[PDB]
Amino acid sequence: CSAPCPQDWIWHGENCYLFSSGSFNWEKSQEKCLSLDAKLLKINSTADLDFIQQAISYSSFPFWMGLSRRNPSYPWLWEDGSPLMPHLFRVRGAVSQTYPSGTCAYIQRGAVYAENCILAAFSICQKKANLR
Amino acid sequence: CSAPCPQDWIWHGENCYLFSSGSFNWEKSQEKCLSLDAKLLKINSTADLDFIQQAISYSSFPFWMGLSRRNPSYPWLWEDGSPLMPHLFRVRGAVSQTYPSGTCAYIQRGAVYAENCILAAFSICQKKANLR
Amino acid sequence: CSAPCPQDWIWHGENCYLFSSGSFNWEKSQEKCLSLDAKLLKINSTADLDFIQQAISYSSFPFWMGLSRRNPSYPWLWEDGSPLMPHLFRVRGAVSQTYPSGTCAYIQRGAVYAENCILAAFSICQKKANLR
Amino acid sequence: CSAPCPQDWIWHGENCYLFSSGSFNWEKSQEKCLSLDAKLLKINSTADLDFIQQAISYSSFPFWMGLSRRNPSYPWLWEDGSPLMPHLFRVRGAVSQTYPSGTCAYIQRGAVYAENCILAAFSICQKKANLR
Ligand SMILES: CCCN1C(=O)c2ccc(Cl)cc2Nc2ncccc21
Ligand SMILES: CCCN1C(=O)c2ccc(Cl)cc2Nc2ncccc21
């Protein structure tokens, strides 16, 4: 009857994941996921990080995730307005830099970094799987 | 109910697709897919080709597919002996040479290349999706 | 017989150019440049603007330039008191807000942005080269 | 009477460096430096590596250097044929993969990696300074 995830997505755990086939800025990447009733990558657990790390281990490219902020004294937040759970990962790089478009997190070679949201990167959309 | 593909595979059309965890000559890549109840990638259409190109678009690795021949005087055949549909893609690369283990094709950055089957590469495995 | 520019600077045209070492506010950045017998960047021509754009093309950071104003009713002026030539660039960003310490301009990704001079950024310093 | 380095280059120590203004594949990047009587970045000392790490500390982008090999059966060699100096840096990433157009080294966030030479990346050209 109901398939857990659409074709071309990857079903893992409670979620479905879609890896982009090209690089786009964080805003365009966000809009792609919204149009598919999804959101940008939200890592909720170490299991989620390990899965993503394995999936992107084929790649040296950067992948946008749904974590951002505009002010470096204020918390990183996922698009849904929740914070980065402690003990998942450290955002490396120039975490204190502000940019006109804000600061956004990306994963590259398994490590998470801060960067100018205006840069074009691959991205990963995530939605809940249709489980029972 | 019955999900079309196991977790961590890509469901596309009537099949499920998986990237190999490691890099191996073509024979060992063939044994690995068979031991997972699958076979090496078989491209039956340009839509298959487009899907695969998109799926590997974030990787620069070569991926073995199930296409091979013993030397240029034999036709290109898939693992199950069926023919290469000639107009789907041109096999570039080492198409004049003869190797002790034969010639095999991999996909890299959208294009298909002939290469010595003894060379190590990643691969893509494929099995039937569980539909209706 | 003597060198146009010190080591680690970039000689272009009749001047020498240097990236700041740290990301600070416009005030402090103007001071560090004065330390080096230099001033903040003054863009005097499209040729100057094109050189800077190429010089920062491998950076996503913003770089303070020597352009600033007290409010949207006071004109954009370089440090030497001279005005911004309109054809060089339109200033984007916060061109209608009013900050205590004024509005300052930085260049990023080829474009120029107004921003509170309190906020921290890298900067480009400029001084005259020793011509023939 | 002559300048150490041409305009738009960075003079450092005994050498001149030219950062690319865009991202290009390794063959194009190499062709660029050759057209300037130069070569791609050759790191022959810890001092060179340290200097390059600070010059690219403004950037999260990848920069091609002049170190390459056709496949793992060939040795890692600089463009001039000299070997990778022992104990200077490790080439990280997938050093044992075989690409159609060879494997090239790049620096990113101070670390050196192997990648498919067909990718587009920034680059750095290097030439002897014309000095005393
Ligand atoms: C969003 C950018 C993706 N990307 C890299 O991140 C990248 C990574 C490494 C190298 Cl050497 C060169 C690179 N340039 C590049 N070229 C073609 C396709 C992808 C890339
Ligand atoms: C050759 C690739 C250069 N590059 C990055 O390396 C890069 C680095 C990080 C992120 Cl998040 C996204 C990136 N994409 C990107 N977009 C525009 C200009 C440059 C880049």
Side-chain angles (χ1 to χ4, degrees):
Chain A
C1 192
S2 56
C5 294
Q7 282 175 62
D8 302 349
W9 296 60
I10 301 173
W11 170 31
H12 179 84
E14 287 212 293
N15 304 315
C16 301
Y17 300 86
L18 179 73
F19 294 73
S20 69
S21 59
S23 55
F24 303 93
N25 72 28
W26 197 87
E27 165 174 39
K28 290 144 36 217
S29 309
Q30 169 177 66
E31 179 43 55
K32 180 68 185 201
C33 302
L34 290 177
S35 79
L36 296 161
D37 295 323
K39 289 193 266 122
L40 256 163
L41 176 60
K42 173 179 190 200
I43 291 159
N44 292 305
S45 72
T46 47
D48 283 1
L49 185 54
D50 298 329
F51 163 78
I52 295 297
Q53 278 173 337
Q54 170 59 224
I56 71 141
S57 70
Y58 303 89
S59 185
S60 69
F61 304 163
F63 287 79
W64 288 131
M65 79 167 65
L67 201 71
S68 68
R69 67 185 177 185
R70 298 201 154 251
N71 181 334
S73 312
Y74 299 165
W76 292 104
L77 298 163
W78 305 104
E79 322 169 77
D80 62 18
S82 60
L84 177 56
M85 322 73 174
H87 313 133
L88 293 199
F89 53 76
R90 166 173 105 266
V91 185
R92 308 152 187 218
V95 295
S96 290
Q97 198 47 63
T98 65
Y99 308 93
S101 285
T103 310
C104 287
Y106 68 100
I107 186 166
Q108 178 169 46
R109 293 186 173 280
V112 178
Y113 302 92
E115 249 297 1
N116 204 324
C117 303
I118 195 53
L119 298 189
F122 287 67
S123 65
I124 298 163
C125 303
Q126 169 185 331
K127 58 159 62 146
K128 288 288 171 207
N130 186 197
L131 290 184
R132 236 214 65 238
Chain B
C1 227
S2 289
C5 296
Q7 288 186 37
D8 306 326
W9 294 60
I10 303 170
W11 172 35
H12 176 73
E14 278 150 32
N15 294 292
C16 310
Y17 300 86
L18 184 77
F19 298 173
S20 66
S21 59
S23 192
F24 294 104
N25 60 54
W26 189 92
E27 158 145 29
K28 181 79 261 318
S29 300
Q30 166 171 63
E31 291 241 23
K32 176 52 84 154
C33 296
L34 201 170
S35 81
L36 299 168
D37 280 329
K39 55 153 187 250
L40 282 169
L41 167 70
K42 173 161 179 210
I43 295 167
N44 286 319
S45 70
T46 74
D48 281 1
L49 183 62
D50 291 331
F51 157 74
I52 291 297
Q53 288 168 341
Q54 283 203 48
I56 65 160
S57 57
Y58 49 87
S59 183
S60 64
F61 290 153
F63 295 85
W64 284 132
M65 79 184 59
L67 193 73
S68 78
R69 78 186 173 183
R70 195 182 300 172
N71 63 59
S73 83
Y74 284 75
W76 282 112
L77 300 184
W78 299 107
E79 292 184 275
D80 65 5
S82 59
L84 177 55
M85 271 297 126
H87 54 273
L88 296 188
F89 50 82
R90 278 102 261 140
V91 194
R92 298 147 59 137
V95 286
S96 59
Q97 296 80 339
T98 301
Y99 297 108
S101 307
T103 314
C104 293
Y106 63 74
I107 188 158
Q108 218 275 290
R109 310 290 303 149
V112 177
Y113 298 82
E115 189 53 88
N116 188 6
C117 299
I118 210 71
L119 196 107
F122 285 87
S123 54
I124 296 165
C125 300
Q126 180 197 312
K127 58 193 215 189
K128 299 295 288 183
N130 175 20
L131 306 172
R132 317 196 111 167
Chain C
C1 60
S2 178
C5 294
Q7 288 187 56
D8 301 336
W9 292 64
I10 300 193
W11 170 39
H12 179 82
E14 280 152 28
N15 299 300
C16 308
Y17 299 90
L18 187 66
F19 288 175
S20 67
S21 69
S23 163
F24 305 80
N25 58 74
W26 195 88
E27 287 210 63
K28 309 270 163 283
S29 296
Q30 166 176 225
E31 307 167 13
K32 286 287 170 216
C33 284
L34 203 71
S35 146
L36 302 148
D37 312 286
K39 48 150 181 203
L40 280 168
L41 167 65
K42 187 190 159 174
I43 297 184
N44 208 47
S45 68
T46 299
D48 276 354
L49 172 65
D50 296 349
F51 163 72
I52 301 299
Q53 287 172 353
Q54 67 98 50
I56 64 165
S57 63
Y58 59 89
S59 183
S60 72
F61 287 156
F63 296 88
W64 283 134
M65 76 181 61
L67 194 69
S68 74
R69 72 187 181 183
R70 193 223 58 180
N71 101 116
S73 303
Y74 287 32
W76 292 105
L77 302 174
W78 301 106
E79 282 176 311
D80 65 4
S82 71
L84 170 62
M85 270 189 309
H87 77 284
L88 290 184
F89 44 81
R90 65 179 281 267
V91 186
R92 291 161 226 191
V95 289
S96 61
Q97 291 81 333
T98 311
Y99 304 103
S101 67
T103 314
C104 290
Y106 58 59
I107 188 158
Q108 94 133 40
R109 309 292 319 140
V112 181
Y113 299 78
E115 181 59 296
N116 191 342
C117 312
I118 294 309
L119 188 153
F122 288 88
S123 63
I124 297 161
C125 304
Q126 169 187 326
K127 63 171 91 203
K128 301 293 187 290
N130 298 115
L131 256 305
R132 164 270 191 210
Chain D
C1 58
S2 291
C5 297
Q7 276 179 73
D8 302 354
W9 297 64
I10 304 180
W11 169 39
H12 182 85
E14 176 152 64
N15 293 310
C16 309
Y17 301 83
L18 179 72
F19 283 74
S20 70
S21 59
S23 56
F24 300 91
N25 64 46
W26 195 94
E27 182 206 35
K28 298 293 185 183
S29 299
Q30 167 183 64
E31 177 201 86
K32 183 176 179 180
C33 305
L34 291 175
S35 76
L36 282 161
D37 310 308
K39 44 102 205 292
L40 272 169
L41 170 64
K42 184 206 180 148
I43 299 166
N44 216 223
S45 77
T46 301
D48 295 356
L49 176 62
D50 170 75
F51 164 67
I52 293 296
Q53 289 176 332
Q54 305 301 108
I56 74 159
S57 74
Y58 300 96
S59 175
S60 64
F61 306 160
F63 301 76
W64 286 131
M65 52 175 90
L67 191 72
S68 76
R69 71 180 168 170
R70 256 110 263 113
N71 60 43
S73 69
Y74 273 70
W76 276 108
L77 295 178
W78 300 100
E79 282 185 282
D80 57 12
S82 58
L84 168 52
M85 192 91 210
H87 218 209
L88 195 47
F89 51 82
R90 64 176 83 121
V91 180
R92 304 194 207 152
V95 296
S96 298
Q97 202 45 63
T98 300
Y99 307 107
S101 49
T103 308
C104 292
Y106 65 102
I107 187 158
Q108 184 169 46
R109 294 185 177 278
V112 175
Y113 301 94
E115 247 297 352
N116 183 341
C117 305
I118 202 60
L119 296 192
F122 282 73
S123 65
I124 297 158
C125 295
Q126 176 191 322
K127 91 203 290 182
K128 296 293 181 71
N130 214 313
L131 258 181
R132 143 83 180 254

